[PDB]
Design an enzyme around this catalytic site. Structure first.
Site, mmCIF file in Angstrom:
data_model
loop_
_atom_site.group_PDB
_atom_site.id
_atom_site.type_symbol
_atom_site.label_atom_id
_atom_site.label_comp_id
_atom_site.label_asym_id
_atom_site.label_seq_id
_atom_site.Cartn_x
_atom_site.Cartn_y
_atom_site.Cartn_z
ATOM 1 N N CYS A 43 32.588 61.375 48.104
ATOM 2 C CA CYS A 43 33.817 62.243 49.196
ATOM 3 C C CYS A 43 35.144 62.151 48.267
ATOM 4 C CB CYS A 43 33.894 61.563 50.285
ATOM 5 S SG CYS A 43 34.333 59.760 50.180
ATOM 6 N N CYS A 44 35.180 61.159 47.494
ATOM 7 C CA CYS A 44 36.381 61.182 46.813
ATOM 8 C C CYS A 44 36.363 60.610 45.267
ATOM 9 C CB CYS A 44 37.264 60.040 47.622
ATOM 10 S SG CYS A 44 38.011 60.749 49.176
ATOM 11 N N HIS A 81 49.841 38.081 33.246
ATOM 12 C CA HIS A 81 49.590 39.485 33.735
ATOM 13 C C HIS A 81 50.551 39.663 34.993
ATOM 14 C CE1 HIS A 81 47.091 42.946 34.322
ATOM 15 N NE2 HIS A 81 47.397 42.814 35.620
ATOM 16 N N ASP A 138 42.406 42.431 41.721
ATOM 17 C CA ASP A 138 42.751 43.695 42.003
ATOM 18 C C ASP A 138 41.677 44.648 42.261
ATOM 19 O OD1 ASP A 138 44.028 46.103 41.849
ATOM 20 O OD2 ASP A 138 44.872 46.147 40.077
ATOM 21 N N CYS A 172 39.891 57.929 51.588
ATOM 22 C CA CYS A 172 39.600 58.633 53.171
ATOM 23 C C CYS A 172 38.839 57.487 53.904
ATOM 24 C CB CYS A 172 38.752 59.842 52.986
ATOM 25 S SG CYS A 172 37.122 59.867 52.494
ATOM 26 N N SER A 223 47.368 47.703 48.130
ATOM 27 C CA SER A 223 48.129 48.278 46.997
ATOM 28 C C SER A 223 49.138 49.479 47.420
ATOM 29 C CB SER A 223 47.054 48.484 46.024
ATOM 30 O OG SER A 223 46.556 49.887 46.256
ATOM 31 N N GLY A 224 49.136 50.067 48.520
ATOM 32 C CA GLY A 224 50.051 51.447 48.612
ATOM 33 C C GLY A 224 49.129 52.606 48.284
ATOM 34 N N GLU A 232 58.741 35.050 36.272
ATOM 35 C CA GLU A 232 59.118 36.449 35.621
ATOM 36 C C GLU A 232 59.112 37.485 36.712
ATOM 37 O OE1 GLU A 232 56.416 38.133 32.608
ATOM 38 O OE2 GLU A 232 57.833 39.971 32.498
ATOM 39 N N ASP A 283 40.110 48.316 43.180
ATOM 40 C CA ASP A 283 40.880 49.471 42.935
ATOM 41 C C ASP A 283 39.357 50.406 43.253
ATOM 42 O OD1 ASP A 283 41.641 51.983 42.151
ATOM 43 O OD2 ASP A 283 41.774 51.395 39.897
ATOM 44 N N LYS A 330 51.592 44.280 40.998
ATOM 45 C CA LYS A 330 52.657 44.822 41.792
ATOM 46 C C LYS A 330 53.050 43.606 43.051
ATOM 47 C CE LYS A 330 52.050 49.196 43.726
ATOM 48 N NZ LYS A 330 53.083 50.079 44.445
#
Ligand SMILES: [Mn+2]
Ligand SMILES: [Mn+2]
Ligand SMILES: [Zn+2]
Length: 370
Positions: A113-114, A300, A101, A118, A150-151, A36, A103, A303
């Protein structure tokens, strides 16, 4: 992003590595044709259960829809594009890569910081990559691991060994549980130290001073160091706090915390002492966190490698394990950038996408050799 259709057209036409991609997913009768894919179009409209006869067909379709995203799902018992003909219950996900994954948001509570990435907090990804990859390769003996940017704010890992692809949710789950250390205080170590724990700690120590004591500055001041104190037993609180007040910098503070934590007595009825609290703090701060769903689920969607991030424009590129330490999410080629590179090179194999394609090919030769 208004120019994304035009850019994606040129990209799907000339740059997307179709032969390499098909070498990958084709690797067993019908194994490519039972995969798929899910494409995403404008407006977050996506179609599920696409599948293709072969490389050429896939190329035509991608060149025709020019999808914003692409997800790869499982290898099914039938062609997904025919699933509506299949009798009740018969259509079933059969195989898929073991996927992870990582993240960056998973660690918000440990960044200063985020909330976003960065230079100062990507090191978290560097450590997650080295830790996870080392366990997969050395402890599980998994030979074919593709790490992918992951972009945006993390990395993916595709475990592609043939036996792995066959593993069930229960086994995938047990692997995740093997790998997980961080579940208030999220890390509690046994007295008897397993090699996984030791080797991950070592990895973390390669970076800990520069990431945590200097980049993040976790013991910089009160509101900082009280967060650390929360992770330690209350009897040693005030001694540590006063020590930290006499101290000037995060390194001093951490050094004292080590000395003091190694002197804490776990049972009144035992003279044994060690680095457990120190390790628990380092791990709670630096160890990867692992969503059981992403890895457990066999159907599942994830990307696709060489996808384009619809917000950042960055390509989902393979990460060279040999240079984990030098990977830089900010210099990842965007679709804009490489399309522009076409004007100066006048050759399609010669953009900044090239070395990533080489990382890919390399991984492919290892599959082949297997
Ligand atoms: Mn995720
Ligand atoms: Mn992600
Ligand atoms: Zn950051």
């Amino acid at each position: 992003p208004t120019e994304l259709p035009e850019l994606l057209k040129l990209y799907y036409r000339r740059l997307f590595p179709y032969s390499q991609y098909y070498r990958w997913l084709n690797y067993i009768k019908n194994y490519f044709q039972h995969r798929e894919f899910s494409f995403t179009l404008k407006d977050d409209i996506y179609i599920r259960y696409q599948s293709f006869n072969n490389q050429s067909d896939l190329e035509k379709e991608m060149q025709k829809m020019n999808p914003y995203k692409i997800d790869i799902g499982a290898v099914y018992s039938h062609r997904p594009n025919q699933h509506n003909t299949v009798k009740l219950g018969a259509f079933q996900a059969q195989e898929k890569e073991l996927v992870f994954d990582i993240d960056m948001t998973d660690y918000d509570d440990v960044r200063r910081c985020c909330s976003d990435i960065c230079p100062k907090c990507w090191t978290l990804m560097t450590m997650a990559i080295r830790i996870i990859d080392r366990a997969l390769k050395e402890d599980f003996g998994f030979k074919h691991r593709l790490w992918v940017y992951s972009g945006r704010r993390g990395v993916h890992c595709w475990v592609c060994d043939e036996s792995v692809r066959k593993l069930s949710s229960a086994v995938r789950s047990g692997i995740v549980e093997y790998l997980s250390l961080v579940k208030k205080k999220k890390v509690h170590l046994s007295e008897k130290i397993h090699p996984f724990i030791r080797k991950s700690i070592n990895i973390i120590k390669k970076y800990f001073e520069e990431y945590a004591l200097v980049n993040q500055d976790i013991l910089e001041n009160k509101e900082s160091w009280d967060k650390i104190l929360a992770l330690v037993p209350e009897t040693i609180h005030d001694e540590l706090q006063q020590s930290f007040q006499k101290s000037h910098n995060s390194l001093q503070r951490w050094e004292h915390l080590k000395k003091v934590a190694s002197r804490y007595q776990n049972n009144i009825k035992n003279d044994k002492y060690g680095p457990w609290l120190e390790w628990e703090i380092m791990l709670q701060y630096c160890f990867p966190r692992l969503d059981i769903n992403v890895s457990k689920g066999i159907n599942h969607l994830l990307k696709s490698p060489f996808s384009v991030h619809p917000k950042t424009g960055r390509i989902s590129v393979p990460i060279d394990l040999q240079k984990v330490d030098q990977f830089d999410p900010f210099t990842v080629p965007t679709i804009s950038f490489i399309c522009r590179e076409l004007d100066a090179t006048r050759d399609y194999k010669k953009t900044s996408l090239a070395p990533y394609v080489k990382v890919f090919e390399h991984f492919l030769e290892n599959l082949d050799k297997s």
